[PDB]
Write a protein that binds this DNA or RNA. Sequence first.
DNA 1: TAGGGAGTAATCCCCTTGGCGGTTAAAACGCGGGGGACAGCGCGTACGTGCGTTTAAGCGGTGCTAGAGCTGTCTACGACCAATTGAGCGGCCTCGGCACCGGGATTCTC
DNA 2: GAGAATCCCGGTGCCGAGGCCGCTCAATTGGTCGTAGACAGCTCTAGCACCGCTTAAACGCACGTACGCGCTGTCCCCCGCGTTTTAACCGCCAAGGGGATTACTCCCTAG
Lengths: 93, 93, 79, 79, 95, 104, 104, 45
Amino acid sequence: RKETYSSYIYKVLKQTHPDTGISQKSMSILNSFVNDIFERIATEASKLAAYNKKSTISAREIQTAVRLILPGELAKHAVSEGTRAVTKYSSST
Amino acid sequence: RKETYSSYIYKVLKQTHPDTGISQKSMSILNSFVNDIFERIATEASKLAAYNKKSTISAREIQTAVRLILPGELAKHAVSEGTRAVTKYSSST
Amino acid sequence: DNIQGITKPAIRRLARRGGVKRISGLIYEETRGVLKVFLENVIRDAVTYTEHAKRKTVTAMDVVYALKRQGRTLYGFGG
Amino acid sequence: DNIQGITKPAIRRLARRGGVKRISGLIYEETRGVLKVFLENVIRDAVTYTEHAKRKTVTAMDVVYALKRQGRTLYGFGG
Amino acid sequence: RYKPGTVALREIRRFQKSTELLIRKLPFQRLVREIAQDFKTDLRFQSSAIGALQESVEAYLVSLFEDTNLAAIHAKRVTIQKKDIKLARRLRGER
Amino acid sequence: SQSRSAKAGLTFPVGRVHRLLRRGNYAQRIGSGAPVYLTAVLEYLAAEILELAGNAARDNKKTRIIPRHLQLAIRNDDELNKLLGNVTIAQGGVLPNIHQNLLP
Amino acid sequence: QSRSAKAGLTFPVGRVHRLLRRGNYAQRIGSGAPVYLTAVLEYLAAEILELAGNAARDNKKTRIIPRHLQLAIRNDDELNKLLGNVTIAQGGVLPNIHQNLLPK
Amino acid sequence: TRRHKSARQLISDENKRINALLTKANKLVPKATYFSVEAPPSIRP
DNA sequence: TAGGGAGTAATCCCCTTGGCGGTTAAAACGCGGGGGACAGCGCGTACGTGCGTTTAAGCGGTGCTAGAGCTGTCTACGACCAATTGAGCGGCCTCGGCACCGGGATTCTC
DNA sequence: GAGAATCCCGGTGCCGAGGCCGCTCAATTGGTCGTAGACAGCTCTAGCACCGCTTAAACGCACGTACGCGCTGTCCCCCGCGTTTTAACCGCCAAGGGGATTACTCCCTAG
């Protein structure tokens, strides 16, 4: 069960460019890019958790790490979309 | 409450150069140096053990780390010194 | 007079510590500019680091770990 | 004859992807030396990686970590 | 016929315009084996590892050619020289 | 019942990144908003890259996504190049740039 | 008797062992790693100490100053590109003069 | 000697005492407590 | 489910901020002037450009098998809890090496 | 040969460097045990060798011109120094802001 992100980026490509296909080398580009971003953001969040005598990683540390990693317009759009997703998930009532 | 490495480098300084004296800024810069070297070796061993399909940390991961991150002459000197120390420790069973 | 806190003998000394001999008479502004961008990068990272810590003064520990993030790590002021 | 086994018109092709019009006659052997020390610094790390892997075959993983660690990470072959 | 300098622009456009590899594969594989057997003898190699080495040295060399051409224009010239290469290597940081 | 990705309105998985965060030994305690925040950030980044790649692939008048289009989308954009100013690309090529005085 | 005295060193193997235990680098850590790490740290500390000493003797001072070990780490090449990306405290730059700046 | 007992936990122990009394009575009706006095939300937009 | 890290209020007191004002070395202005930037020029030589000869780059065919990869079994290593004692940190105190300081040797410079 | 301007040497004030002591909380010792790791065994992907063949490319070489490189005059723009202006440094007492630490209930997250 070798695990990869192929199906998910296949659909989010399919909701905006329906008549377009992906090559396998390109498929690997997006897979490696997603894994690299995940690794960078997660190790920065762990470093910031170890900053403050804190043994728990929560959403605030990842928000600070996103504001640290990304450039500014990407950062403000990422925290806007992530905050909307968190408020969608939390108000599941 | 504050943690440092004062007396051990003090007695190493006395047994090596018994007529020399250390400033506190010097005390601090080699504390920064030793913490940096500790952090580098330990994160290299952690990444190596995590991405080498293993769950523990042993002498092999750290000997790869001291062979790999720092230049070869003092690397093999430290490898010889640490293998001598670990054979001394394993001899006293 | 806001940016004019740093001055001609200061960057003359800094260029002399670069080992240069002859300077130009209007290398002033681009050095002032790169000065400004280096400080605003460093204290922007320091402000975010101290914002997450709920510490509304900027400490030395934050700026040395900001440099260690930036790859220009400092020794002696903690770490 | 393997150090100049890669050849000089190939070096011209790589240079004219790089956008340089005229090249000297004395730059071939120094680019060969730069290339040789670059692969030396890469497969030293790669052979330590495959030595610790209890393997004789150098795979794509060992080389891709070897250029990942030197700040030259490469996409696509890490799958 | 063409004046000297127009067909050079044509081929530099063609080389920047494409994406093919520019290094012969078998001399590179021989070079990799002969540069690896000193560290460890009787080694085995993966084909995509050779491809990774190929694309890494291609990217490194073309970036090196950018900043050595920048050294060439900086010295009010066109042809690169060896001191341009040494200046680019020094200003990059390595020795 | 139903997954947390549809609960938060996302297509990327949430339990998968929760698992990958769990035994990735970043910390021994992980909150509940951490995978949904990471999932939304990865959503936005993949969607932006796929938007620019599809625009470059259509710009080539060619119906698939080839890594030359990925290179064009990465280097044409300003802060995507800033985020990816370190990573070397597979089979991508080099953007066409000639310095001004070389033109006669 | 401490384990550092059992292995014949002056560095705190239990302290370095707990410092790598609560750092979440792994969930299970063997026993050869702390003695090996404390041996490597002892060798490197002894090395930088003896370069500091021999940089202190020629500069007519029996106290080590950060300037002296700045020249010690700028004069030895191995420590120079071991620590090329770091910068140190009020030690300045080692003196060098390039020849065309030298007149006559 | 007393604990500080700030204003946030006075509400907490008051409604926990009210809930304890109501659950005892279930196994009655309040008249005027601190939470029945509270104004309801408005019905106009 | 249930243990515990985190939220939260209080509270001690360290350190940072403001500001007298006095000093004085350091910055600002200005002005003579000379070594260097820089535009122009010209010998020539090294490398573009193009054509003939040569070489082993690429293919692809396939056999051999090395070892990468996977699985089951055994077991020996390391987390985990508990008792406990001295190593090692906070604080205090004498003193000597280097900071300072001034007279004069001495060695670059024009 | 004048003229500063560093280097040398003796004297002196001073403040952190090293040594010592109280004592805490962390290193060590010791036994349990689930389980990750060693390790033998086994399937078969894939890496190595290589026979021969078309030919693109590599190599070689001749011709010549844009260009590297030395020379040079000239405008001028920084260099060196004296004077004047200005604010940096320093002593330093003081108000209180705001972490450091402490106490403690509880929602939050591992299992």
